[PDB]
Amino acid sequence: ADFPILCQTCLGENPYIRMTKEKYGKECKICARPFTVFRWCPGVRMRFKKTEVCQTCSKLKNVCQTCLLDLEYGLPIQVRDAGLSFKDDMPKSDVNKEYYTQNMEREISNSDGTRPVGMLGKATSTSDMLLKLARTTPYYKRNRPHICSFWVKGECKRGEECPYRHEKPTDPDDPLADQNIKDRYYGINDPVADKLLKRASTMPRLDPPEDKTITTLYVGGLGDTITETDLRNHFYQFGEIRTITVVQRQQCAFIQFATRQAAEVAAEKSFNKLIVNGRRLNVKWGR
Amino acid sequence: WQPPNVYLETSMGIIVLELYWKHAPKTCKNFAELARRGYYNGTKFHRIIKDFMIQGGDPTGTGRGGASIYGKQFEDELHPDLKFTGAGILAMANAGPDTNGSQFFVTLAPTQWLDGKHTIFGRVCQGIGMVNRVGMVETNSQDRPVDDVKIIKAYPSG
Amino acid sequence: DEEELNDYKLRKRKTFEDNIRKNRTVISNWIKYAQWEESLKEIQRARSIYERALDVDYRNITLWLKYAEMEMKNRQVNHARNIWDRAITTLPRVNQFWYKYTYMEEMLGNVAGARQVFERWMEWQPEEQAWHSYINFELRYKEVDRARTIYERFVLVHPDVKNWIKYARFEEKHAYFAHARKVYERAVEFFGDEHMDEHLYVAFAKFEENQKEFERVRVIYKYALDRISKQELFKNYTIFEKKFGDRRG
Amino acid sequence: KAKRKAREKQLEEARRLAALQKRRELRAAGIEIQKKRKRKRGVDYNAEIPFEKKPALGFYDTSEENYQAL
């Protein structure tokens, strides 16, 4: 390798990062074979991390060789794949998996080291679903240590040097507790991923009306910095518009459309996020 | 002097573009006199954005070449109602306005964004299935495609 | 169908796998594995199967064949065409590949494609019967311009007098007699002095007998006999019989 | 040699039979006990296409193509 592949969270904060290398250090639980191991000092009194997957095992799905989440968005791989509608055929059984890994490394040897191989580019339409489920700031709780089992029973007699966060241990009844690393990599029943599914299912999106002839769309929360041509340029080449009523006595709008699916495109993509000159409009189908 | 449909019979197949001088007389004269000049022979498609745009027409083929009939560049001939709303929008693009040179772009789909930044000048009245074929092809990381595609014959309509 | 069936599948699969593990040469096991799969209708399985078998032996006409037969019986017609072109790319001098490609293309109707694949094919100048089926294909259509283009190309890649003859045959039947005259001229002036001989000329005299031009029949007959190598002896008796014919009729 | 192996060609099947008839009645009785697992290439068949090659595509429309079932 040249260096690891991991997100900013796993990657660190200080401008000068310190990581030690060992060639052929241990076994990628994916490629199953020896890899290089680079070990990075995450943060002040924060657990030193290490590279935990073959670089090819990484370029396969385009995820973090330490943080394990995708490198573009940073959600569970099950999620990110489905958010691209992506459907990978990676084999599972022992002999099948070894044959797959061998030919995979052969096929990746013909690469230039810039981007993951295969459908990872022909699924690069990062949907606003993924964009919105994407975390914003570095959830740097990751580099805090374990539960110092001594310090959970009382025993951690080393003073403050408990090797692990001497807090209350999580009740493993939580589905967010035991996610086998191999399953999390295979996209195999990640309960955290199902939580992201429930969250991105309950997260607000624009609603559909009943009758097809309701082609009037009310956009609530306009303000008096908007123009009718600006409401147009928001919803104009996204189809054809038939008319628009910019209600200044109520600070809203209403686009009567010329294509129903065009209306759907503009409005559903616009739900609360059509931010032209900074005003939170609400795209709905009018009365 | 407005060559109605200018033929660029490219290597993979023909193209012919009708430019509306009433909408874009200046770059229309540019493209007419330029195709008649034939200095385009050997232009490799300088950008391929699959299903969005096909762009070429540079004697350099890197993205930093190209000169016009007027010097290096001229201003835009901007339109009120002409848009890049669909494939075959033939508009010479700018890296900054009033700097339109030799490189030419040909759309592949609705591109209503570069409207107001590109004077949409006409359409490919020939070769549009071929344009879809071209916009399909595999390009490297730098939009100069892995296929070295150039025009066979550049000339006006009579 | 939960697990009795499923374990019957598991068994038969493990068997076929072990048989091809032992040999992985001779192909009957590869086929029978694959056709068992196709009968259970998992064409993704069967597809990978034929790719692997094709890897171990890419020179097997029966392998290519029944691969594409699966694809056609299941009308992934695009997939099938990819198969056929790959075949005719790697094993061109096999003919039945070209054939089945066309036939399937025909009942598909894309006769433009059929024409161009025949152009491909003829780039190899394959074979007389190949040309002839090309022409029967073209005359399943009106396309007599095509047909004479192909007789043009065929008789002129293959210097045969009887090829000349079949060209004029088609001219006579589809009723282009002036073209028949041109082709008799061309033929005899190409074949000519040395190794040109009786039978193109007897055909010429017969066509002009159809034209009932007896004096020029006489002159062409004896003039060709005399100008070119003459005769040999049994053929000369044939010349005597044909002479009685041409004189009487 | 030959004919012996013909004899166990059936009496083997009785074994999966007596395994089937017991176990289908066994596990349906209210006990889902498994014999046990260590099978290193056994499941390569019922689970995945064992060693897979994807059919290479050429010049045609293969995606929307798909097939009906049994």
Added chain:
Amino acid sequence: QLSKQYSSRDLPSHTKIKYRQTTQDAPEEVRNRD
């Protein structure tokens, strides 16, 4: 994946190549000869 096993026969031995000298028959004299 380079193993650490080893062999009695792969021990270093005969580590210089005897080059064909001037008098024996060097490629030079072969360049000349009739």
Added chain:
Amino acid sequence: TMPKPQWHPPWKLYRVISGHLGWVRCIAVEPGNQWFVTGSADRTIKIWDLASGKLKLSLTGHISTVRGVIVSTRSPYLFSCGEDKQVKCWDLEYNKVIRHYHGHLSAVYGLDLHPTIDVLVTCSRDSTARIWDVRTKASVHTLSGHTNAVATVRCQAAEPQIITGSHDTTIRLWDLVAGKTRVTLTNHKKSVRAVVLHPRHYTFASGSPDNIKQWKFPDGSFIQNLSGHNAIINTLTVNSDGVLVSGADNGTMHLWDWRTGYNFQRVHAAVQPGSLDSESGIFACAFDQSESRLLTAEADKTIKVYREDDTATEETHPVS
């Protein structure tokens, strides 16, 4: 057709050496032209004086048929190669084996030397070739990719440096340093057992029961066929003067012109007294370094030596 071929004189049998006890399978000539060396299927390697044909010495190390021998231009070394899967390096100043290259998995069908560097190429029946470092007996590269016995291998200094013809009926030209196949020529229909390189013409020929073919370096482009010799072809060997000897396996050996492809002579020798007629067959041919004598190693345990005929002229032997 073609220009008219040069007239070459004929060749006439003039010596027949008999001392081996099984098929004679390979033959080679010293650099300095004092002695040639034969390796036979009675497992011995004999060393004969080239003037008189007297046997100077016989070395016995192998366990089975010696299937190829060669002698180093740069070092006092003979390299032998056998069906016991072993490749040996005889040092000719003690007459002793000093080095042995282990690692093939079936008979080694042939072997060649690089003229500039000290490396070795060997081809075997496990359908691979190998590149050994002469001096540390280590396999630097395993040229794999054929799918049957790799009948023959030749190496040159120009590029590509390694040409192997096999029994799956294809030829491959290999990049040495990369160690992998550049070009794959599938023009022959039957197994390819002999290939040869012109000394001064960046060209090479490849023989099979179908017909010899001529090709052009470095991308292996067809040049011409050569036909007439319809028999299993065991050897091709090309002179400096455009003579091309093709010796076959049913005994017959034809002589051609390298350039125009015109077979001007056909020799059919007679088997040594007590042989069957189905024990006529030629396994090795070699031009001497004066390129005046032509030695052949035969399936009836003989070495037949042919010389150039000095009293013939274009009017004695018209050219067709």
Added chain:
Amino acid sequence: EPPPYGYRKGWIPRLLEDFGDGGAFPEIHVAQYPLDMGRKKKMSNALAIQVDSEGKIKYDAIARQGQSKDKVIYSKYTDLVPKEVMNADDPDLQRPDEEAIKEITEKTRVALEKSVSQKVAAAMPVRAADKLAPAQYIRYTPSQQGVAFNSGAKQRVIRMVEMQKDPMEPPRFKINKKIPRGPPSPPAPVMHSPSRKMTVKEQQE
């Protein structure tokens, strides 16, 4: 057909027919779809149907499928056809001159010997180990750019150190794993002469 230039106002052509021989009306405020234009279509697996620089159907792509521009793949008849040469004095019939030859000798010797000596030191196995080389200083430009991560810097400069290998440490991993051999190469094309079927007589002979 398409209304004239300056007289094209008022109508919006929605069926590709009103394009006549083709054309988009940029001043007409619609997405113009003359001859299949405008629509992003289903992502289907047919790879790029290329055409030669003379207008033909280059199946050299189907041959060289998934292969680099290094591979020579003879599948044209113009390779089957016998060239003619009559000059023992052409450029075609001339080898590289010994300057290139000595260059390629030196390059070959070098790369050869390095790979040799690594495989030879493999037969050392008691590595009289050399110590750990000087420390690595590498400048990393993340592709992730953003004010919040790396606490706001666009580069990180990183120290790599080589961790000691313990001498008395046995091998670590089970090397001897067997699997079948990987799928070969893109098969070559069989450039054979026309093959003849034998008479049944011959067959019985």
Added chain:
Amino acid sequence: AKTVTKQRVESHFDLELRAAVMHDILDMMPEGIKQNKARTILQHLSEAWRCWKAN
């Protein structure tokens, strides 16, 4: 890749004799197009040897 020692000398001679046969004619002087009965020409070869040995 084990050597040929003293106990595999006869076995090895026959591996290679009958390999050589199978290369030699039954696949390079055929024209028995079907499936060249090499498995039976090898049976002749072994009976020719038994008959030589028994005179």
